[PDB]
Amino acid sequence: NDIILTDDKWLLKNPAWTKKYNEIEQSMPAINDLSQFLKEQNVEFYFALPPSKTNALSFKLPSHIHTYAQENLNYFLKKLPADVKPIKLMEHFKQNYTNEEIQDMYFKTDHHWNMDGAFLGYQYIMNTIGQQSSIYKGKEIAAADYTRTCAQNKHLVGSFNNQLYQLIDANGEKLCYYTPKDGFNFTSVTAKDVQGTVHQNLDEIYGVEAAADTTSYAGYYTDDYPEIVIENNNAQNEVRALVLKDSFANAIVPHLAQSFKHTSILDLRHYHEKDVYQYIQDNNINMVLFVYSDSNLSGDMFKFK
Ligand code: NA
Numbered sequence: 001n002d003i004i005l006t007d008d009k010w011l012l013k014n015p016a017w018t019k020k021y022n023e024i025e026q027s028m029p030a031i032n033d034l035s036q037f038l039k040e041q042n043v044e045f046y047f048a049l050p051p052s053k054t055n056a057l058s059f060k061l062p063s064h065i066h067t068y069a070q071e072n073l074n075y076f077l078k079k080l081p082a083d084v085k086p087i088k089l090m091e092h093f094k095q096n097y098t099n100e101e102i103q104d105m106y107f108k109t110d111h112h113w114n115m116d117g118a119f120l121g122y123q124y125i126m127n128t129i130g131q132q133s134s135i136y137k138g139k140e141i142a143a144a145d146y147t148r149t150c151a152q153n154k155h156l157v158g159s160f161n162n163q164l165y166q167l168i169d170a171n172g173e174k175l176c177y178y179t180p181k182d183g184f185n186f187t188s189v190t191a192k193d194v195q196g197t198v199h200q201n202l203d204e205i206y207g208v209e210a211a212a213d214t215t216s217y218a219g220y221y222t223d224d225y226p227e228i229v230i231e232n233n234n235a236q237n238e239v240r241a242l243v244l245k246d247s248f249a250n251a252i253v254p255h256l257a258q259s260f261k262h263t264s265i266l267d268l269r270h271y272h273e274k275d276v277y278q279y280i281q282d283n284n285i286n287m288v289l290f291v292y293s294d295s296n297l298s299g300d301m302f303k304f305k
Contacts, residue, residue, distance in 0.1 A: 002160065007060055009169060011158055013111040015054040015061055016069040020298060024072065027298035028079050034304050035081040037277060044133055044287045045083060048125045049073070050118070050248040051090035051102075052295035053111045059099045069295060076297040087128045089121050090294055109167045110156035110217050115176035118251040119143075125291075126259055135286060136239050138259055146178040155214035166214075175220055177207065184254050187231040194226060194270055206254055222250040226271040229264050230257040237261055242285040244268060244276070246301060249291035260287070268301045276304040 005012040038045045055069035105117025123141045154175040158165030191199045209219030239260040257263040
């Protein structure tokens with residue numbers, strides 16, 4: 001049972017009205033377990049935390065009411081086993097940018113970060129992994145190796161559960177892509193959707209409705225798939241990554257996949273064929289990377305067994 005806030009026509013989904021320490025406690029054992037298993041199997045374990053829009057833009061909420069996005073996140077980060085390496089995106093963002101600048105990294109009418117936010121996120125994620133990892137060597141992520149292209153007056157349709165929100169606002173907004181100078185050249189791209197249909201090639205899942213004047217985040221970037229598998233033989237490493245994600249990862253699924261030789265991308269809301277432990281063993285995963293919004297700290301996507 002969600003709640004939506006509107007204000008100067010920005011849309012804010014499920015602000016942190018309450019502490020969720022109790023919900024975090026109840027889900028943390030699954031992580032403790034996974035963490036111990038992965039440490040045994042010599043598999044690196046990163047937990048990237050894109051800033052939820054209601055954290056990054058909590059300054060737009062009524063000033064007479066305190067919200068707890070940062071407390072909840074801090075609680076999660078303190079209860080995390082020390083062998084989980086968190087990537088603290090809100091902290092990085094708030095350290096380098098003002099509130100008004102950070103607002104330019106989110107869509108106004110949809111509750112995800114935009115491509116500029118997601119890219120900066122990608123950059124910090126890979127930079128951190130690069131400093132921590134024994135198996136990941138790669139070129140530092142510079143904006144100069146990508147070409148950024150943008151359309152100016154697109155209209156994002158808010159989508160969450162079975163709900164579509166649309167804002168009549170003649171301006172609309174920025175829709176950007178960051179594309180490698182020589183394109184994404186993946187050896188293969190395979191994605192099973194929720195109906196069981198298998199799609200091949202990046203073009204059938206990423207930016208499929210880019211030309212649309214009005215559509216959802218999912219249409220502009222990707223939908224949520226049970227499983228995407230990407231083989232990248234041109235990668236200068238042997239990393240076989242497993243990305244476990246919520247929809248914040250969609251905009252940067254191919255940018256992440258470019259870093260590693262193999263990338264498996266699961267959404268546990270939809271992937272039910274194997275559990276995570278078995279998937280990791282069946283596919284010789286030597287690196288795990290969560291990409292969960294920092295408000296997605298507990299609940300259904302933390303069921304790994
Ligand atoms: Na600053």
